[PDB]
Design a protein around this nucleic acid. Sequence first.
RNA 1: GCUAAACCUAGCCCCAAACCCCCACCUUACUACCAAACCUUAGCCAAACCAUUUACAUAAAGUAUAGGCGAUAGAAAUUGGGCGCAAUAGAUAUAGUACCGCAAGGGAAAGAUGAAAAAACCAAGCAUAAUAUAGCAAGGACUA
RNA 2: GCUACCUAAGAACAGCUAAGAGCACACCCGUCUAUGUAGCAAAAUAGUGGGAAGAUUUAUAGGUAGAGGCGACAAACCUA
RNA 3: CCUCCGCAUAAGCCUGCGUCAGCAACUGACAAUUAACAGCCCAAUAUCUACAAUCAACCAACAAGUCAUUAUUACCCUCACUGUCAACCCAACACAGGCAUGCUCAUAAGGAAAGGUUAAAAAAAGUAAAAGGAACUCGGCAAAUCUUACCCC
Lengths: 26, 117, 97, 176, 211, 192, 41, 45, 139
Amino acid sequence: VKKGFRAAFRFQKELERQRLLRCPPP
Amino acid sequence: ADRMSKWTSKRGPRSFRGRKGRGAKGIGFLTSGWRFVQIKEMVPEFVVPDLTGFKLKPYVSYLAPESEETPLTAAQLFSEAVAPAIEKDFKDNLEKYGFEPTQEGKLFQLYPRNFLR
Amino acid sequence: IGIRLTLPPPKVVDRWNEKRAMFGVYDNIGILGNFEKHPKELIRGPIWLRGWKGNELQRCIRKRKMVGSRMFADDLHNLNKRIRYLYKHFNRHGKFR
Amino acid sequence: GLEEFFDDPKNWGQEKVKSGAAWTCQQLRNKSNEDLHKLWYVLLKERNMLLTLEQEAKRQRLPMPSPERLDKVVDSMDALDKVVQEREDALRLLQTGQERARPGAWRRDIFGRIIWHKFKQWVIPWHLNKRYNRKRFFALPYVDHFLRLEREKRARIKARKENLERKKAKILLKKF
Amino acid sequence: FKTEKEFMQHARKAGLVIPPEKSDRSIHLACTAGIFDAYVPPASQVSIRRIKDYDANFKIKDFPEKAKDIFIEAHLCLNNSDHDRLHTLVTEHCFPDMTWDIKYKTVRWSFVESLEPSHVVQVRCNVYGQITVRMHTRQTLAIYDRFGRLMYGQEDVPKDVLEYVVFEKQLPYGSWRMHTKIVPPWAPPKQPILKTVMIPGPQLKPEEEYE
Amino acid sequence: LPPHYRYGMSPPGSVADKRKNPPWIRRRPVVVEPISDEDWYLFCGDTVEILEGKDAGKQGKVVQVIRQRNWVVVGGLNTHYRYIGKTMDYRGTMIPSEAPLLHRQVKLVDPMDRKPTEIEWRFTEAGERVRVSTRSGRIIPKPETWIDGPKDTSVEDALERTYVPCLKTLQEEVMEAMGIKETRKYKKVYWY
Amino acid sequence: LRNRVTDRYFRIQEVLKHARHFRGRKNRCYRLAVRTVIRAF
Amino acid sequence: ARGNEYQPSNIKRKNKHGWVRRLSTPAGVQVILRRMLKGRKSLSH
Amino acid sequence: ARNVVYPLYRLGGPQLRVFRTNFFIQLVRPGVAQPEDTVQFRIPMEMTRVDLRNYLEGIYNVPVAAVRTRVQHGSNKRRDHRNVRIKKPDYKVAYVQLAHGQTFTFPDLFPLYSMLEEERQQRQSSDPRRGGVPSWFGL
RNA sequence: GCUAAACCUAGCCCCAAACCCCCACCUUACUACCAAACCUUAGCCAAACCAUUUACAUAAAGUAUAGGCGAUAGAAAUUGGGCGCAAUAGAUAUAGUACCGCAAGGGAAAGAUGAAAAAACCAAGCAUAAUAUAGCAAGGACUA
RNA sequence: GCUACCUAAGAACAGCUAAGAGCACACCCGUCUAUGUAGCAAAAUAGUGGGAAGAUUUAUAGGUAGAGGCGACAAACCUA
RNA sequence: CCUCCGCAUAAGCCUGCGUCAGCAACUGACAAUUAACAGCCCAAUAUCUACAAUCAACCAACAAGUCAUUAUUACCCUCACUGUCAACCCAACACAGGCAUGCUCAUAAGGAAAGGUUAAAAAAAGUAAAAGGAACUCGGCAAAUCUUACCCC
Ligand SMILES: [Mg+2]
Ligand SMILES: [Mg+2]
Ligand SMILES: [Mg+2]
Ligand SMILES: [Mg+2]
Ligand SMILES: [Mg+2]
Ligand SMILES: [Mg+2]
Ligand SMILES: [Mg+2]
Ligand SMILES: [Mg+2]
Ligand SMILES: [Mg+2]
Ligand SMILES: [Mg+2]
Ligand SMILES: [Mg+2]
Ligand SMILES: [Mg+2]
Ligand SMILES: [Mg+2]
Ligand SMILES: [Mg+2]
Ligand SMILES: [Mg+2]
Ligand SMILES: [Mg+2]
Ligand SMILES: [Mg+2]
Ligand SMILES: [Mg+2]
Ligand SMILES: [Mg+2]
Ligand SMILES: [Mg+2]
Ligand SMILES: [Mg+2]
């Protein structure tokens, strides 16, 4: 468990972008 | 090759299996021809009372009241055991009251225990 | 994949904590307390480095000569070996000389 | 007889047997020594009965009828033995002033630590006891470094525990 | 396994001895195993006072109104799978009997106006009130699949339903909830189903023959 | 029981406990706030009131106190729904099991005011200790036959004081009682 | 480790996004993809 | 034939490595002390 | 008694006497076929053959004629999650032959759910003609 | 979509303070019982070999001195809780256990639900989905 | 606890011809070939062989310890 | 159809193919090996113990050998404790290896070389082979038959 916030935040947003490009919203 | 196992009597060669025994106690001695003499007095005699008409069962009924723990200290047993004898023989040689300075001639000695349990 | 899937729990920081709000007070206790104390008496730590800065070889030599008598035995032995290594390193190895 | 290794045969297979309380200690300090002797054999026979019934419970792959009364009997046996040893200790303190029924001495082994050596009974005196005079009760000066390493190891364990208690205290103040 | 006795006999054969342990907390149930006295369709005022002495404000002349509003609202919670409301509206003996098989399928039950004034039928009675209510209504079902294709009943066509709904109440915080629903043996069968069913015969071992 | 054992709804020695807490788990220990032994004031039988979440404002009765986690199990309230008896083919039955509450989520009830009350351990001349509410000065008490078998003592025989205190041992008293005689005196051995 | 690297997934994904059409393990494994992506540039 | 080596017997094991032999000389006493300072479960055979 | 230092006997000394017996006893069922005059016990380790004779003569008043004990090695072959050997404890077993022609057989010891079993009667199994339709609805 | 991933807290570290801790067991340890201890460390290494030699509060002071007067060694008088770690990290430690060794000795790995169990997305590797002439596996491109 | 040598008290050596004799088992060793080469084996297997009443072989306990031991010298053996 | 194995004891190991339950002896629970065999011995102080063994007799030796009491005093109790199981030990293994002794020397005891099929090459082990019979090769190594003679050390 690597301490920090910024890689967890950016990776949280790229998981959001892959959730969009997997199931695109109407 | 084991280290962790307890060195029991089941384990060595015949000379090792012979000498070591369990937690039993010696009852007699060996003589020539390896003949075991059992000493009669070394055997524990289980002194067992008569259990006839004895009215104490192994459990106590739940209706018995609850009290406090008062362990028998030496001052209590001196008080109820000796103190009225001192008060009755003072209102009118400590061996008169149940005191023994020495106990080498005594059968059941208190220090060290020559009785059992 | 060495990266975490959930964002960490948030880090609340009280900037007006007792330690943070009164931080640095009595640093100028010498220059406006009539020089009765020095601010190196205001620091708390190991007794061999209250008011002193050295490199590692100096911190270990000073540590041994100040508190090394009542150190534990393998701490004293490890510290003697560290002084012996750092001696052999600082005085014999290195680029600039 | 052998039927005293078993209980009342109406209780065989009832899966629940009522029993009273355990003998507590103050109820036994009111009794005589003869009464604690006979009661010792009462509880002894009861303990043997409940132990045969435990082992037959493990044999038949069945649960106990009431396993709590074996704990009651062991508690009454321990209570009676403790009350008797209280009377032994009080009478020993009156007659001899000793606090331990068995003599011994604070000695120091080869290993440097101080150990209570409980004395054994012997026939011959200690100066011509061949096996006793091989058992050496003195620490030679190669031991003192290891005593110091033991002292420092226990001090590390103590410092770890105390510091860890302080860390748990800090986490408790952070949470509440 | 199939019962408790097989698990106990395999607990004896396996050697796993489970001692019966006593805990001070038991299960605070809020139901009954069915009906106290099963009403049989084609004097119990003592039980009514046995409700009014625990409840102290209870009117049977207002009750089959509420029995309607407890009924329909509960079935409206099948349209939305609102189980949080259902445990306030329905008992625990009824909740698997009406919500288990409807899992992973959308129902679109819908009430339309009743045919008779619904009315109380019988009342019986740690203390469990129980009120059986006769209802004769007009409902519409449409039970779908996981795949949203119809398998029971058209959505538009209303059907007329006989309903012997048994209520139960815990008698400090409970209310009236649907406990069971008496289906009588003289009743007509339900709607037919849209699909066909194969029902297998006896699966024969080779030494066995079919007779 | 291992260190950092996790207390739960099951007692610490049952069977489903050993399904839940086997001797090889190492889980995160629950940070519980340290209530002193004298500071705990919720007992198995108190009528309490739930403050938070589901069944808020309802008053129930404490059925179980799991004191190693500051837990109060209100009977019949704060219930969730679990099945039981679920075999291979039968789906079990529905049961309203009970979720435990922290004691912060719970306040006591005056038996004459019926309100959530903060409770202190006031001292009075009549009783050394007992619960006293703060919104009113009222004492809350502490909340809550037998036939002998053939193997129980009577109460009277369990309390006989047949103990004449004497300076004889158990051994000397039993040897004098049994009438056992001994002429062989004990011979002194060496202790070392 | 006082400060060890957290942002390392994104450096690997800086290189590997140019390799998404390669053959073999060049599209997948970073050690191979760095050489073929440098070489492609 | 090589590798059989360990050819066991309890007499040679207790009289080679046992507690009484380790306490016969002060070198083996220091062996037992290193075992107790390391914390091992078996100090000797 | 066990876990007690016995007082040492010299020649001509008094009889060694135990008043409160420390060790217990339990008679188990024989797992093998044995003669009808033989009772099998589980002696605790520190109890000899003579002590078991005088134990059963004194306390239980059984006319005990022969005693033949043996020691059973409980297996040290079962392991933790720590791969550490668990030792089942060793135990001494007495074999007692009784006098006077007596005969012993081990006696044949050991010869909410209303709601559960009353929903196991009313299970109301799904008719196969229903095909998965929930049977709650009155339609 | 499998393998898997993730996680936060067991604990640990560096300071401060304070001077710590029934029974059997030196015979074959875990066994109820019979006629004597002290004695210089050395060597690696530096001297580019090696052979004398080579370290084990502040300030005076790297001064006086010593030294194949060379490598280097070196006084005294006198003076006066965390910008720690967080499960490959931090203790080896969940444990000096398992295991290895005749023995001295060496020495591990690991856990993550929730208030209550009395309730997805992403490494490699495959799969979905084998292959089409030609060649550091691309690049310029191209309708492709 | 292997191995080198020794100490103590033991043991085995069929049959045939007639003694550190010969043929020859058991047993000890390992000449030569072949297999095996992450093997059955960190040195084995199959056959052939040398010895087999002696300076034999072997079980058990004990001794010698690294600036050493031990050696029918191979500068061997002293836990692969 | 094999057997050069087996059965015991010694040493070793320590419940390790008993019951119940869960390529095609593991886990949990329970149970057992019972002393007559074998270990575990000896009251002192003086005093005795020249003549092997080998069927021990003739013989025949040399390397010169494995076996014993008496005097007086003390002595009167007795059968305890321990081992006893297995398909087993040492070789990391359910390892073609290593392992002392007494019995059977073909077994009365113990076991199974082949998962099934086809009948390639190469490889291993074997049997047979016309005519020739060392022409092979470093060398009659191997195999088959058994033998003469001469050197070197
Ligand atoms: Mg050997
Ligand atoms: Mg140099
Ligand atoms: Mg050189
Ligand atoms: Mg000075
Ligand atoms: Mg670690
Ligand atoms: Mg580690
Ligand atoms: Mg992947
Ligand atoms: Mg090209
Ligand atoms: Mg010869
Ligand atoms: Mg040759
Ligand atoms: Mg010959
Ligand atoms: Mg030689
Ligand atoms: Mg030579
Ligand atoms: Mg040479
Ligand atoms: Mg056979
Ligand atoms: Mg086969
Ligand atoms: Mg085949
Ligand atoms: Mg031919
Ligand atoms: Mg030629
Ligand atoms: Mg040619
Ligand atoms: Mg040839």
